[PDB]
Amino acid sequence: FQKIYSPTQLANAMKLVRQQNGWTQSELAKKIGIKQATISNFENNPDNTTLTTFFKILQSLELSMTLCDAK
Amino acid sequence: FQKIYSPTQLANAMKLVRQQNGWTQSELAKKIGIKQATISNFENNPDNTTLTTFFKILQSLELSMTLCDAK
DNA sequence: TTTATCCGCGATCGCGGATAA
DNA sequence: TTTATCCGCGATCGCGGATA
Numbered sequence: 229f230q231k232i233y234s235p236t237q238l239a240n241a242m243k244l245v246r247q248q249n250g251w252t253q254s255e256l257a258k259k260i261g262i263k264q265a266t267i268s269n270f271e272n273n274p275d276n277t278t279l280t281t282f283f284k285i286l287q288s289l290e291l292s293m294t295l296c297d298a299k
Numbered sequence: 300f301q302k303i304y305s306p307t308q309l310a311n312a313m314k315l316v317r318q319q320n321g322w323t324q325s326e327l328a329k330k331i332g333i334k335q336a337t338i339s340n341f342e343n344n345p346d347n348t349t350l351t352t353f354f355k356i357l358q359s360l361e362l363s364m365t366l367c368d369a370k
Numbered sequence: 371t372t373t374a375t376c377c378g379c380g381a382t383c384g385c386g387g388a389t390a391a
Numbered sequence: 392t393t394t395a396t397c398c399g400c401g402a403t404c405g406c407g408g409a410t411a
Contacts, residue, residue, distance in 0.1 A: 233358075235354060263406070278382090279306040279346060291368065292302040294302055
């Protein structure tokens with residue numbers, strides 16, 4: 229768990245968490261009630277993703293976030 | 300620095316950091332080059348706010364984020 | 371099976387700009 | 392001075408759905 233500085237970095241880290249637990253986009257989507265396509269857009273093109281989508285996906289991954297010093 | 304679970308909670312936490320440092324929306328917006336209106340929409344209505352905006356505002360605040368376990 | 375891409379649709383974004391208050 | 396709100400604009404969202 230490290231500091232995250234961009235949407236791309238964020239999406240890559242969460243995608244890795246998804247893969248490391250062997251979850252599919254479809255099963256995560258079903259779990260929180262959004263489209264599989266929405267998870268695919270977030271993983272690939274996270275820049276315009278809504279905060280609401282990010283939080284729903286975070287919950288699906290059994291994750292949360294905290295703020296920290298940029299340093 | 301607490302676990303954050305929603306856009307509102309995130310926006311409230313970041314607004315608080317802005318105020319605790321005595322920073323105005325205008326000076327943050329000018330610092331990273333976005334609209335003052337954009338920071339205002341984020342603070343009040345964060346749900347559909349983009350990941351790009353959220354990250355720009357974090358940088359303006361000298362903040363970063365980290366993922367963690369949801370518990 | 372898994373993931374990425376496309377349609378139309380209604381909604382909202384963030385922009386420049388100008389207010390409102 | 393500070394922050395919230397509105398306009399028009401082009402872009403993109405996330406939706407149900409159906410492909411690639």
